[model samples]
Target: CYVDTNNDGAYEGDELSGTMEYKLILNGKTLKGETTTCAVDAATAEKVFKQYANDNGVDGEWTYDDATKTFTVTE
Candidate 1:
């Protein structure tokens, strides 16, 4: 993960350690107002997407913010 250096959907280069993983935000879990984190993988992309989505009601929209490597999702 190249740090979303451009804030684009496609993550650029390979990232270094610790910060390699991008972030995920599921709907309303932050209702408690605590920030959350999750590991990301193009390999298991669809798997994790459906898992959390089905559990949280997929709202059919997503955005990958390369600027902060955040994968924002809604339900």
Candidate 2:
């Protein structure tokens, strides 16, 4: 999946964000994971991107900023 940040209707250059992964495991329904390195504060990132995560059906790692409206999914 990707985001059209420039609003140019084309996802070229850095706009080609990356890919998302979904796995099927037998057990209780839950989403859980962890990242050792983070671009921004982990707590803040989680709070800020909660909605975006739900909207995109993603529970992976990502970062966001308040002023510049920046968001990214990374390792």
Candidate 3:
């Protein structure tokens, strides 16, 4: 799944406190996924993001985009 940080609606740049994107893979195939953006503090953001990744059993590389203020997970 992909996240649009500056998207219209409740996720506009100023409203966007943090964002997370997760994809579920089962048996070498992606089953489903979702992206969530919340207006939360930095510590909350970190905890939620890590929790999501761990819950989904994600084992890959993660990178942060400073320009867009987004994170990417690649397998």
Candidate 4:
């Protein structure tokens, strides 16, 4: 794991797919904050990350594409 660089709380979005682990990109962050696995019923990794773009009215929405392993956030 690495520092939540932009401090959005969740360790996802532009924080993955590395030649090495624990790498950081400048000024990038995840849309959803701290979560409780609202989606992804078996409680997989996807659930943990995409749980709540709605928690306490975050103002953006995160949609997951399981086939692509991607998340798109819209405000």
Worst 10 residues of 2 by lDDT: 19-28
Model 1: pairs clashing at backbone N, Cα or C within 3 Å: 1-15, 4-66
lDDT of candidate 2 over 1-75, digit per residue (tens): 443557787778765745222222111135433322222333544454554446445545555454544455442
Worst 10 residues of 4 by lDDT: 19-28
Candidate ordering by TM-score (highest first): 3, 1, 4, 2
Q: Each model's TM-score?
A: 0.42, 0.26, 0.48, 0.27
Per candidate, the number of residue pairs that clash is: 2, 0, 0, 0
lDDT (CA) per prediction:
0.50, 0.43, 0.48, 0.38
Q: After superposition, how far is residue 48 of candidate 4 from its true place, in Å?
A: 1.9
**Of 2 and 4, which scores higher on TM-score?**
4
- Show the colliding residue pairs in model 4: none
Candidate 1, residue 21: lDDT: 51
Q: Which stretches of candidate 2 lie over 4 Å from their true place?
A: 19-45, 48-75
Tens digit of lDDT per residue, candidate 1, span 1-75?
Answer: 333434574555642222335455665543211133434444354455546555665455667676865666654
Give per-residue CA lDDT, model 3, range 1-75, as digits (tens): 223445644445545444434332222124235455443443555566667666667647766554544555555
Indicate the residue-level lDDT of 20 in model 3.
38
Best by lDDT: 1
**Residue 54 of model 3, lDDT score:** 67
| Candidate 3 residue pairs in backbone clash | none
